[PDB]
Swiss-Prot record:
Reported impact of L124Q: In wr; destabilizes and consequently reduces protein levels, as well as those of the GARP complex
Protein name: Vacuolar protein sorting-associated protein 54
Subunit and partners: Component of the Golgi-associated retrograde protein (GARP) complex, also called VFT (VPS fifty-three) complex, composed of VPS51, VPS52, VPS53 and VPS54. EIPR1 interacts with GARP complex and mediates its recruitment to the trans-Golgi network. Interacts with VPS51 in an EIPR1-independent manner.
Family: Belongs to the VPS54 family.
Stretch of the intact protein here: 844 to 974 of 977
The protein's role, per its UniProt record: Acts as a component of the GARP complex that is involved in retrograde transport from early and late endosomes to the trans-Golgi network (TGN). The GARP complex is required for the maintenance of the cycling of mannose 6-phosphate receptors between the TGN and endosomes, this cycling is necessary for proper lysosomal sorting of acid hydrolases such as CTSD. Within the GARP complex, required to tether the complex to the TGN. Not involved in endocytic recycling.
Gene: Vps54
Disulfide bonds: none
Length: 131
């Protein structure tokens, strides 16, 4: 019976070093992210293409709930770093031109993420990036 936990205990470990990879990727990219047209920006197109690739790699591999938990944590890291850069660039949620560009770029990001199998109903809480 222990065999049951043997799996879930192990898989939780692969999930952790998968989110670290994205955390590193996000830090690298979003640290040099600059708000400008068009949208999706090259930075965001790169990011979505990467999350699409990882999703394709683990989907058949992990149970749906784990895949869902995994991409919630990836999204959490994404929001963490994005928020950080927005604050750095002094961009705020005031309804201005630059605000709109980021909001549009983010809209593309969630549009993509939500289309990935098993992830359509994720509670993403994207507003957090503005704080």
């Amino acid at each position: 019976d222990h065999i049951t936990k043997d799996y879930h205990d192990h898989i939780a470990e692969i999930s952790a070093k998968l989110v670290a990879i994205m955390d590193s990727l996000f830090d690298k990219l979003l640290s040099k992210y600059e708000v400008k047209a068009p949208v999706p920006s090259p930075c965001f197109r790169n990011i979505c293409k990467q999350m699409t690739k990882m999703h394709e790699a683990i989907f058949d591999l992990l149970p749906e709930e784990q895949t869902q938990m995994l991409f919630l944590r990836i999204n959490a890291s994404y929001k963490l770093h994005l928020k950080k850069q927005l604050s750095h660039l002094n961009v705020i949620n005031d309804g201005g031109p630059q605000n709109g560009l980021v909001t549009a770029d983010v809209a593309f990001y969630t549009g993509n993420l939500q289309a990935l199998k098993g992830l359509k109903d994720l509670d993403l809480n994207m507003a957090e990036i503005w704080e």
